[PDB]
Design a binder for this molecule. Sequence first.
Ligand SMILES: *C(=N)[C@H](C[C@@H]1CCNC1=O)NC(=O)[C@@H]1[C@@H]2[C@H](CN1C(=O)[C@@H](NC(=O)C(F)(F)F)C(C)(C)C)C2(C)C
Ligand SMILES: *C(=N)[C@H](C[C@@H]1CCNC1=O)NC(=O)[C@@H]1[C@@H]2[C@H](CN1C(=O)[C@@H](NC(=O)C(F)(F)F)C(C)(C)C)C2(C)C
Lengths: 305, 305
Amino acid sequence: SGFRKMAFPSGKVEGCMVQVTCGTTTLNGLWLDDVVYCPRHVICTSEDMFNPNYEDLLIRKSNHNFLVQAGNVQLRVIGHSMQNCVLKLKVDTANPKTPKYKFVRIQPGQTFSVLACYNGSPSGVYQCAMRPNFTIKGSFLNGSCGSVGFNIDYDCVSFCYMHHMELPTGVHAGTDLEGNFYGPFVDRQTAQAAGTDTTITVNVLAWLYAAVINGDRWFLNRFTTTLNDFNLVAMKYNYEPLTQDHVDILGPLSAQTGIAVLDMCASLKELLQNGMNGRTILGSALLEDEFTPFDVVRQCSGVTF
Amino acid sequence: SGFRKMAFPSGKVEGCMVQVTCGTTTLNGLWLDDVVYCPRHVICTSEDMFNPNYEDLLIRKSNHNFLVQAGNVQLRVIGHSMQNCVLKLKVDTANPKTPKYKFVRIQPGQTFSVLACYNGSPSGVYQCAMRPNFTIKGSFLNGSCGSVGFNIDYDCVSFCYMHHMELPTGVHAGTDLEGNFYGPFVDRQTAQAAGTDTTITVNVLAWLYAAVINGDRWFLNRFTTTLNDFNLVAMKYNYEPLTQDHVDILGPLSAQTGIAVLDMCASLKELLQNGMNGRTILGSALLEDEFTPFDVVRQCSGVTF
Ligand SMILES: *C(=N)[C@H](C[C@@H]1CCNC1=O)NC(=O)[C@@H]1[C@@H]2[C@H](CN1C(=O)[C@@H](NC(=O)C(F)(F)F)C(C)(C)C)C2(C)C
Ligand SMILES: *C(=N)[C@H](C[C@@H]1CCNC1=O)NC(=O)[C@@H]1[C@@H]2[C@H](CN1C(=O)[C@@H](NC(=O)C(F)(F)F)C(C)(C)C)C2(C)C
């Protein structure tokens, strides 16, 4: 028992982190087989980042202008190209620690682990969610760019995020590993802001099932609701609409606990309309929305990698 | 910017996890050089665990009764001994992935990362604190025993915890790596309960400094206080006494922000006496006490390993 915000073990990703320097700009890269992936603004000086022409800046660079360091070892760059907002640096050595991996683009509401890195060295690991407004609530400083987010399934690392920038209010934005931004953001130092965020309804429901499994049951009421009537109530409280797909992914937790999804919705509806009256759920005074249904099943069943 | 509950990168520890089976009992072990460390109740059947005589159970075991598996490879056990509540299994192969390490006994109030494992394979990593009542608020299932807690300092892993048992209310108890329990607990399946816990005052203060650094400043008031008068107020709210040693370890955060420790104490005093009135600090509606001062400096300064 117990329920914690849990990250994936980071070792498989640690073995892929490198340092990339171009000129005086340094950030992190991801070394998979004989390719290093990193944010393209490594080729910018401080003055270039407000209105960069990346194609022009890249045309002026040769392979040898990129200093790639894996630990205390320089990797020789033998090719380079740009794909959307990432650079791909071909190196003459394949990373022997390359895990089985794929590149995935995740959906808003899905969670992943971030391995925050500086100068190619890991600082820490934490779990976060792709918010409905396409930001993440991370913890990132200068030099953190190129840190990656990932999920693990058995032996396979699915990379889903590479870090590029910080938006107002201390939230973070980045790309998939093909260099395409999540959300409407661009890698330029300009006036950009995230849209209004929304609470991830299906994740709150998943976390309420986690609470029941841990014996924190006070919020269960005696009612049910229709999906439509729940969604009318949730809307006012800035919760996203609950879809039938969301209901379906809650199926395993509903079957395990015997609590119909729409019954849990009735209990959540009451929490939104009446508050928690100084009570906590799994130690939290606010409803938590950064556990997916699969996160709850993994943690409560002890899935390993 | 941003502030997250952050774990250490787990890779160095992942490389040390193994599976230990004796009879039909399986749990995790820690493989460092040519020794595997694991909880001694691996030698118990289900019926032995209520009133075990570990010395007697161990006398009946030979080296070959211990099946140690590192991945898909069996490690030959060539010696065995018991030290307090841990078994030490000498194996004929040294772990090539052994990091620089030490064994430390941590103090209540200090934090560490846990790599939760089952059958020698990692499930997840999370950050926790040794509570004043010598439990941790973890997430552990059947078969999790032998999972370890640790800190990292540059290249050196300080192992401080090995998991043994779950107490009422879903909190967890274990030993240092010399097999000595934290707290008054014994590795026997008997009626045991943790004492009343207390809030880790110095950690709450550290987290309030983290809030200031992130620009969440609303709670700063215009007053100071004496250490004695603060401790009188904190006592009623089940906060531990703040010592001069605690004041001293807050020094770096106090110097960085220019907020005297006793001034922050005056602000905390007001939060305890008046509540937060529906406000949050760093997104939390409750005061957080599982960041140490050094945790805050590490995260806000980007310390790497
Ligand atoms: C990459 N190492 C950093 C990571 C930042 C630094 C502070 N916290 C982070 O997460 N990325 C940048 O510095 C990028 C880089 C130029 C400017 N920038 C920003 O993150 C800036 N933000 C924006 O311009 C905004 F608001 F549009 F997102 C900054 C004001 C420095 C936080 C480029 C190319 C975006
Ligand atoms: C080790 N793999 C498990 C970990 C437990 C299982 C459920 N959650 C955990 O953290 N440890 C045990 O099963 C130990 C083992 C016998 C009994 N036990 C317990 O944790 C039990 N608790 C106690 O006996 C109590 F309350 F005293 F702590 C249990 C009721 C199964 C949770 C021994 C030798 C302590």
